[PDB]
């Protein structure tokens, strides 16, 4: 049978699913590790022990335990990201969409979801891989990984909760794809990992980590970079938050053993309930449990690894959306609301910058404020709002990614950069939020090809080009069709720094993506904060 | 006789001079102090002892001893500022142009020349007061004052060379105008002092100095402000340069008395020859001997005097020219020359910023550089050149003046601000220098009304409006004709901050003159340099 695949962990049975008036196979909920429950909670994952019989892979698996957004009950804009399956610590599974008839050896794409390292699911409707597997003829995999304290509690030195275990979950799923994807018609020497936000940062972390470099061929990073200020913490800061988490649950705190023991007896929801109480600052865009710079997964600081070329050398395709600050300002800064235009007062403007650059002293907060204020119109509410969106997005996503691409390109084998700014025709979030985080995922996964979703024809066309760029790049290291007639996405070089806009209009090539602001965030502000 | 005036210091005899096909009287070279020669060198000036007979006031007096520009022999652009009379320490005289027939009691205007406190003359062709006395029916006075070491050598504590004596020379001439201008038909209760560059800064210093406030009614400041970073030094820095000047002339240095004694035996040219060797930094736009913040002429720091309203409350009219950096960059920064377009390399751009902000540490030099560099085109030679012009002009003239006007306006009785940007039709300096320092003096003094000078008709028209604005303001505290039909120059208020452009086109009103850059120079850079 075409839905029966024999793998090294055992036999797996899929299900035929319909797609755009045709059908493909889907193997959902394949386990790739032992359930990390009980005394295994916080521990490195272990490989799934082979099984006898046939694993029923016809339905989505549980989603990892995580914070659930309840800010807008009923609003599809936020609910679409929440877990859509029961939550469970038993959640280490992966999903595979396979073209039909079964390929013999084709390009494999492995999706890594975002969610700030504190949430995320591989089973969301926006991540359904059938449209892309089907259209681009690729075997599409989406993996899963522990988030929150479950995936990132870090007591460096201890082997019981060493940190980075969520990164090891991703790695294990990639090891499983490397070892078994051939049986699904996938080419293991051509796997491209790709992900967005924390997923984009994770992709970059596997590029840096010696232990992960050999499990894939190429990478795509969307609105996420490994050096993002919210993506990692030192071992000391991780230890500090683990202890603080412990203090919030009345734990015995005088040994890592007592602390861990205590945390392991607590129900998932008890950890999730106080997880935000451990942040060191009153901040925005900062998450409690994230990767730690431990000397193992990451041998040295990310910046020195980047400077010395200590990373996998291959091709990468990456980019950002125009409005990377909107979402977090809405959720956490004063003056913003979902149902108003959110014009921001000078007073809220400054409270916002304070929330956005937590680690800044006053001279630093003054530098950011000077840098983004138009002093001829300092009380313009729209300018203040838009200014904050740029500050949050530049500082947290755009400038860290521009720093990463410029550093990577000096040693890599090819870089392609994009700036996605298509203005949705079907606004679900208010208009002031602009081209919000994740809106491009809809095109990468080809949702515009389904009529019942109401996208414009030009959006369907945009979706097909994006999907073909991603897939062609995954197959070859180049998003462009060899000798095609379409406009050529240029390679980004350390000298000319070209990138393209990604929207419904004729491709336009630009240079030095947001250099003016990024020289401020990557060069000036840091030197200033270090002097003072 | 109309050319014979009897004053409190004695009888004075003038000369009839022709002007625009008519004639007025001129009393040139009237002495207002004892010659500050010999043991009087460096000392406070003393009042001129009355004389018997008739003082021949028919020819210009000597010019004070000073550095002579020889950078461009023959070039009229530079030669026009050099002394045009014998130089002599015996130089404390004033000139008066009086309408004919003699007024009974009219508006008096007193001109104070610029020259960085190290040079300047009241006898230059650009300062000939006949066109303005004649056209606006004002009694026009130009005074003179000691410059360089002769006027500003400062050994605070000593009564032999206390500092600020050049400022006391100006004051004495104003005391003489206050006491005698009635005999020339001048109204002593309506004297407006006005000056440019160091002359503009001096005007502001008389506004601050309790000892000078009662000698005049109103003030006009052009490209000069009392708080300009080059306009004053602390008593310690003045003492330091006096000692260093002494060391350059082999003086006995162990007592102010020995030092002064030594400096007094030296010929004028010996002091002028080493005067530039005492600057503390490799700088641009810094002069050796300038006013000192001594606790007398200035009771406390200029900034605290400005904050507390410790200054004369009256009306003021002031402004800048578009290109206040050109002249000093030409003379002192690498990459600039008079006969090339002076496109500036990135390398010279940074050497220039270094020369322009002498007192800056590296984080500071980085802040200026970030602030004026367009990172999408960092190697554009024209942008780099123009960027330097803005840095020099903003830092040295525009931003200090904007700080002064905003502070003054909080307590003053009326402020009028201008931004002069007329593009000369008769370029004498290269075009890249733009609307250079002092080009507006030509219009204030009405040179465009004389045909042999070749100005365009619209320039003659501009000259007549400027002269009438200055004169009407001097007469009334308002540059505008009561109920006129011409566009109204608006009052500058702390709230709306309006100013006008001054050029050959229809008056255009703007707001917040260069706020963006001046918030950087007046607020951010200083806080940064103080932290670090
Ligand atoms: C990616 O790597 C390949 C191979 O390592 C590079 O191709 C080589 O290019 C150099 C110079 O053009 C030639 O001397 C070799 O003959 C090429 N080798 C092969 C197998 O083609 C290629 O230039 C790299 N691309 C980028 C963007 O760095
Ligand atoms: C300059 O000062 C004059 C007088 O000190 C101000 O005129 C006074 O204005 C207030 C409010 O309009 C009145 O109560 C007085 O009756 C006025 N006095 C006179 C003599 O007119 C004038 O407002 C000031 N102008 C500016 C620009 O500050
Ligand atoms: C990233 O992983 C990230 C980026 C943007 C939002 C979040 C919040 S958590 C789940 C989620 C995601 C991944 N994307 C969204 C896009 C738009 C609106 C949303 F509500 C939404 C949501 N919830 C996480 C990082 F956090 F690293 F920025
Ligand atoms: C000011 O007093 C000043 C401003 C500009 C130049 C100088 C140099 S000294 C004599 C002089 C003056 C007053 N103005 C000029 C304008 C244009 C070209 C010139 F060559 C020139 C000259 N020499 C002094 C201060 F120094 F304070 F900036
Ligand atoms: C797999 O599970 C689904 C739903 O739980 C069920 O309908 C289907 O029949 C199962 N297949 C087998 C053979 O277990
Ligand atoms: C004044 O001086 C000028 C030139 O030195 C001379 O021509 C003129 O006659 C003098 N007048 C008197 C009366 O001294």
PDB file of N, CA and C in Angstrom, chain A residues 432-485:
ATOM      1  N   UNK A 432      -3.720  49.449  11.505  1.00  0.00           N
ATOM      2  CA  UNK A 432      -2.507  50.082  11.998  1.00  0.00           C
ATOM      3  C   UNK A 432      -1.337  49.080  12.232  1.00  0.00           C
ATOM      4  N   UNK A 433      -1.652  47.799  12.414  1.00  0.00           N
ATOM      5  CA  UNK A 433      -0.609  46.805  12.652  1.00  0.00           C
ATOM      6  C   UNK A 433       0.160  46.476  11.369  1.00  0.00           C
ATOM      7  N   UNK A 434      -0.369  46.896  10.219  1.00  0.00           N
ATOM      8  CA  UNK A 434       0.357  46.666   8.960  1.00  0.00           C
ATOM      9  C   UNK A 434       0.623  45.216   8.582  1.00  0.00           C
ATOM     10  N   UNK A 435       1.776  44.966   7.956  1.00  0.00           N
ATOM     11  CA  UNK A 435       2.172  43.633   7.514  1.00  0.00           C
ATOM     12  C   UNK A 435       2.827  42.921   8.752  1.00  0.00           C
ATOM     13  N   UNK A 436       1.945  42.395   9.593  1.00  0.00           N
ATOM     14  CA  UNK A 436       2.275  41.729  10.836  1.00  0.00           C
ATOM     15  C   UNK A 436       3.061  40.442  10.703  1.00  0.00           C
ATOM     16  N   UNK A 437       3.694  40.112  11.813  1.00  0.00           N
ATOM     17  CA  UNK A 437       4.397  38.844  11.908  1.00  0.00           C
ATOM     18  C   UNK A 437       3.558  37.714  11.359  1.00  0.00           C
ATOM     19  N   UNK A 438       4.195  36.792  10.673  1.00  0.00           N
ATOM     20  CA  UNK A 438       3.455  35.624  10.235  1.00  0.00           C
ATOM     21  C   UNK A 438       2.491  35.704   9.091  1.00  0.00           C
ATOM     22  N   UNK A 439       2.168  36.883   8.590  1.00  0.00           N
ATOM     23  CA  UNK A 439       1.240  36.950   7.464  1.00  0.00           C
ATOM     24  C   UNK A 439       1.836  36.271   6.243  1.00  0.00           C
ATOM     25  N   UNK A 440       3.159  36.331   6.064  1.00  0.00           N
ATOM     26  CA  UNK A 440       3.825  35.660   4.924  1.00  0.00           C
ATOM     27  C   UNK A 440       3.723  34.098   5.037  1.00  0.00           C
ATOM     28  N   UNK A 441       3.569  33.551   6.247  1.00  0.00           N
ATOM     29  CA  UNK A 441       3.456  32.100   6.385  1.00  0.00           C
ATOM     30  C   UNK A 441       2.243  31.628   5.503  1.00  0.00           C
ATOM     31  N   UNK A 442       1.165  32.407   5.508  1.00  0.00           N
ATOM     32  CA  UNK A 442      -0.041  32.106   4.716  1.00  0.00           C
ATOM     33  C   UNK A 442       0.343  31.888   3.226  1.00  0.00           C
ATOM     34  N   UNK A 443       1.269  32.702   2.706  1.00  0.00           N
ATOM     35  CA  UNK A 443       1.656  32.528   1.339  1.00  0.00           C
ATOM     36  C   UNK A 443       2.646  31.396   1.201  1.00  0.00           C
ATOM     37  N   UNK A 444       3.550  31.237   2.174  1.00  0.00           N
ATOM     38  CA  UNK A 444       4.515  30.144   2.068  1.00  0.00           C
ATOM     39  C   UNK A 444       3.777  28.803   2.058  1.00  0.00           C
ATOM     40  N   UNK A 445       2.713  28.695   2.845  1.00  0.00           N
ATOM     41  CA  UNK A 445       1.979  27.460   2.878  1.00  0.00           C
ATOM     42  C   UNK A 445       0.836  27.361   1.841  1.00  0.00           C
ATOM     43  N   UNK A 446       0.738  28.387   0.990  1.00  0.00           N
ATOM     44  CA  UNK A 446      -0.231  28.378  -0.079  1.00  0.00           C
ATOM     45  C   UNK A 446      -1.697  28.441   0.228  1.00  0.00           C
ATOM     46  N   UNK A 447      -2.102  29.047   1.340  1.00  0.00           N
ATOM     47  CA  UNK A 447      -3.522  29.190   1.667  1.00  0.00           C
ATOM     48  C   UNK A 447      -4.288  29.979   0.605  1.00  0.00           C
ATOM     49  N   UNK A 448      -3.640  30.940  -0.094  1.00  0.00           N
ATOM     50  CA  UNK A 448      -4.397  31.678  -1.114  1.00  0.00           C
ATOM     51  C   UNK A 448      -4.880  30.840  -2.285  1.00  0.00           C
ATOM     52  N   UNK A 449      -4.359  29.624  -2.463  1.00  0.00           N
ATOM     53  CA  UNK A 449      -4.847  28.799  -3.568  1.00  0.00           C
ATOM     54  C   UNK A 449      -6.194  28.196  -3.261  1.00  0.00           C
ATOM     55  N   UNK A 450      -6.666  28.261  -2.017  1.00  0.00           N
ATOM     56  CA  UNK A 450      -7.973  27.676  -1.748  1.00  0.00           C
ATOM     57  C   UNK A 450      -9.040  28.781  -1.779  1.00  0.00           C
ATOM     58  N   UNK A 451      -9.980  28.627  -2.714  1.00  0.00           N
ATOM     59  CA  UNK A 451     -11.032  29.618  -2.941  1.00  0.00           C
ATOM     60  C   UNK A 451     -11.859  30.030  -1.734  1.00  0.00           C
ATOM     61  N   UNK A 452     -12.339  29.060  -0.973  1.00  0.00           N
ATOM     62  CA  UNK A 452     -13.142  29.379   0.182  1.00  0.00           C
ATOM     63  C   UNK A 452     -12.440  30.352   1.152  1.00  0.00           C
ATOM     64  N   UNK A 453     -11.146  30.598   0.973  1.00  0.00           N
ATOM     65  CA  UNK A 453     -10.449  31.504   1.878  1.00  0.00           C
ATOM     66  C   UNK A 453     -10.474  32.964   1.413  1.00  0.00           C
ATOM     67  N   UNK A 454     -10.914  33.221   0.194  1.00  0.00           N
ATOM     68  CA  UNK A 454     -11.068  34.623  -0.177  1.00  0.00           C
ATOM     69  C   UNK A 454      -9.792  35.417  -0.238  1.00  0.00           C
ATOM     70  N   UNK A 455      -8.896  35.093  -1.127  1.00  0.00           N
ATOM     71  CA  UNK A 455      -7.729  35.935  -1.194  1.00  0.00           C
ATOM     72  C   UNK A 455      -7.962  36.459  -2.583  1.00  0.00           C
ATOM     73  N   UNK A 456      -7.263  37.517  -2.954  1.00  0.00           N
ATOM     74  CA  UNK A 456      -7.415  38.051  -4.287  1.00  0.00           C
ATOM     75  C   UNK A 456      -6.639  37.166  -5.226  1.00  0.00           C
ATOM     76  N   UNK A 457      -6.880  37.341  -6.518  1.00  0.00           N
ATOM     77  CA  UNK A 457      -6.177  36.568  -7.524  1.00  0.00           C
ATOM     78  C   UNK A 457      -4.697  36.901  -7.456  1.00  0.00           C
ATOM     79  N   UNK A 458      -4.360  38.177  -7.277  1.00  0.00           N
ATOM     80  CA  UNK A 458      -2.939  38.536  -7.238  1.00  0.00           C
ATOM     81  C   UNK A 458      -2.278  37.920  -5.996  1.00  0.00           C
ATOM     82  N   UNK A 459      -3.056  37.683  -4.935  1.00  0.00           N
ATOM     83  CA  UNK A 459      -2.504  37.043  -3.735  1.00  0.00           C
ATOM     84  C   UNK A 459      -2.227  35.569  -4.040  1.00  0.00           C
ATOM     85  N   UNK A 460      -3.094  34.940  -4.848  1.00  0.00           N
ATOM     86  CA  UNK A 460      -2.886  33.539  -5.225  1.00  0.00           C
ATOM     87  C   UNK A 460      -1.619  33.490  -6.053  1.00  0.00           C
ATOM     88  N   UNK A 461      -1.452  34.490  -6.890  1.00  0.00           N
ATOM     89  CA  UNK A 461      -0.281  34.507  -7.747  1.00  0.00           C
ATOM     90  C   UNK A 461       0.986  34.701  -6.904  1.00  0.00           C
ATOM     91  N   UNK A 462       0.868  35.534  -5.871  1.00  0.00           N
ATOM     92  CA  UNK A 462       2.002  35.806  -4.987  1.00  0.00           C
ATOM     93  C   UNK A 462       2.370  34.517  -4.217  1.00  0.00           C
ATOM     94  N   UNK A 463       1.339  33.827  -3.729  1.00  0.00           N
ATOM     95  CA  UNK A 463       1.536  32.580  -3.023  1.00  0.00           C
ATOM     96  C   UNK A 463       2.264  31.542  -3.893  1.00  0.00           C
ATOM     97  N   UNK A 464       1.860  31.441  -5.156  1.00  0.00           N
ATOM     98  CA  UNK A 464       2.510  30.481  -6.029  1.00  0.00           C
ATOM     99  C   UNK A 464       3.972  30.874  -6.276  1.00  0.00           C
ATOM    100  N   UNK A 465       4.273  32.161  -6.404  1.00  0.00           N
ATOM    101  CA  UNK A 465       5.698  32.524  -6.597  1.00  0.00           C
ATOM    102  C   UNK A 465       6.497  32.292  -5.310  1.00  0.00           C
ATOM    103  N   UNK A 466       5.925  32.630  -4.162  1.00  0.00           N
ATOM    104  CA  UNK A 466       6.689  32.432  -2.978  1.00  0.00           C
ATOM    105  C   UNK A 466       6.950  30.929  -2.806  1.00  0.00           C
ATOM    106  N   UNK A 467       5.896  30.113  -2.896  1.00  0.00           N
ATOM    107  CA  UNK A 467       6.062  28.666  -2.755  1.00  0.00           C
ATOM    108  C   UNK A 467       7.083  28.113  -3.738  1.00  0.00           C
ATOM    109  N   UNK A 468       7.102  28.660  -4.952  1.00  0.00           N
ATOM    110  CA  UNK A 468       8.042  28.136  -5.918  1.00  0.00           C
ATOM    111  C   UNK A 468       9.456  28.631  -5.598  1.00  0.00           C
ATOM    112  N   UNK A 469       9.599  29.863  -5.087  1.00  0.00           N
ATOM    113  CA  UNK A 469      10.943  30.357  -4.681  1.00  0.00           C
ATOM    114  C   UNK A 469      11.486  29.434  -3.535  1.00  0.00           C
ATOM    115  N   UNK A 470      10.656  29.203  -2.505  1.00  0.00           N
ATOM    116  CA  UNK A 470      11.082  28.388  -1.369  1.00  0.00           C
ATOM    117  C   UNK A 470      11.446  26.994  -1.798  1.00  0.00           C
ATOM    118  N   UNK A 471      10.615  26.406  -2.652  1.00  0.00           N
ATOM    119  CA  UNK A 471      10.842  25.031  -3.089  1.00  0.00           C
ATOM    120  C   UNK A 471      12.000  24.940  -4.041  1.00  0.00           C
ATOM    121  N   UNK A 472      12.126  25.878  -4.954  1.00  0.00           N
ATOM    122  CA  UNK A 472      13.229  25.797  -5.892  1.00  0.00           C
ATOM    123  C   UNK A 472      14.532  26.028  -5.134  1.00  0.00           C
ATOM    124  N   UNK A 473      14.500  26.945  -4.171  1.00  0.00           N
ATOM    125  CA  UNK A 473      15.690  27.163  -3.392  1.00  0.00           C
ATOM    126  C   UNK A 473      16.050  25.885  -2.580  1.00  0.00           C
ATOM    127  N   UNK A 474      15.032  25.211  -2.036  1.00  0.00           N
ATOM    128  CA  UNK A 474      15.288  24.032  -1.233  1.00  0.00           C
ATOM    129  C   UNK A 474      15.955  22.981  -2.108  1.00  0.00           C
ATOM    130  N   UNK A 475      15.447  22.801  -3.348  1.00  0.00           N
ATOM    131  CA  UNK A 475      15.991  21.824  -4.288  1.00  0.00           C
ATOM    132  C   UNK A 475      17.389  22.117  -4.800  1.00  0.00           C
ATOM    133  N   UNK A 476      17.693  23.407  -4.995  1.00  0.00           N
ATOM    134  CA  UNK A 476      18.960  23.796  -5.606  1.00  0.00           C
ATOM    135  C   UNK A 476      19.918  24.778  -4.950  1.00  0.00           C
ATOM    136  N   UNK A 477      19.498  25.499  -3.917  1.00  0.00           N
ATOM    137  CA  UNK A 477      20.388  26.476  -3.335  1.00  0.00           C
ATOM    138  C   UNK A 477      20.150  27.815  -4.017  1.00  0.00           C
ATOM    139  N   UNK A 478      19.119  27.888  -4.880  1.00  0.00           N
ATOM    140  CA  UNK A 478      18.810  29.131  -5.623  1.00  0.00           C
ATOM    141  C   UNK A 478      17.294  29.229  -5.854  1.00  0.00           C
ATOM    142  N   UNK A 479      16.652  30.315  -5.388  1.00  0.00           N
ATOM    143  CA  UNK A 479      15.198  30.428  -5.585  1.00  0.00           C
ATOM    144  C   UNK A 479      14.752  30.599  -7.043  1.00  0.00           C
ATOM    145  N   UNK A 480      15.687  30.941  -7.915  1.00  0.00           N
ATOM    146  CA  UNK A 480      15.367  31.158  -9.323  1.00  0.00           C
ATOM    147  C   UNK A 480      15.411  29.945 -10.227  1.00  0.00           C
ATOM    148  N   UNK A 481      14.469  29.929 -11.164  1.00  0.00           N
ATOM    149  CA  UNK A 481      14.396  28.901 -12.192  1.00  0.00           C
ATOM    150  C   UNK A 481      15.571  29.199 -13.123  1.00  0.00           C
ATOM    151  N   UNK A 482      16.502  28.239 -13.259  1.00  0.00           N
ATOM    152  CA  UNK A 482      17.723  28.289 -14.084  1.00  0.00           C
ATOM    153  C   UNK A 482      17.691  29.395 -15.148  1.00  0.00           C
ATOM    154  N   UNK A 483      17.183  29.021 -16.324  1.00  0.00           N
ATOM    155  CA  UNK A 483      17.043  29.947 -17.439  1.00  0.00           C
ATOM    156  C   UNK A 483      15.544  30.178 -17.550  1.00  0.00           C
ATOM    157  N   UNK A 484      15.027  31.079 -16.730  1.00  0.00           N
ATOM    158  CA  UNK A 484      13.605  31.392 -16.758  1.00  0.00           C
ATOM    159  C   UNK A 484      13.503  32.769 -17.381  1.00  0.00           C
ATOM    160  N   UNK A 485      12.294  33.279 -17.468  1.00  0.00           N
ATOM    161  CA  UNK A 485      12.096  34.595 -18.046  1.00  0.00           C
ATOM    162  C   UNK A 485      11.637  35.597 -16.982  1.00  0.00           C
TER     163      UNK A 485
END
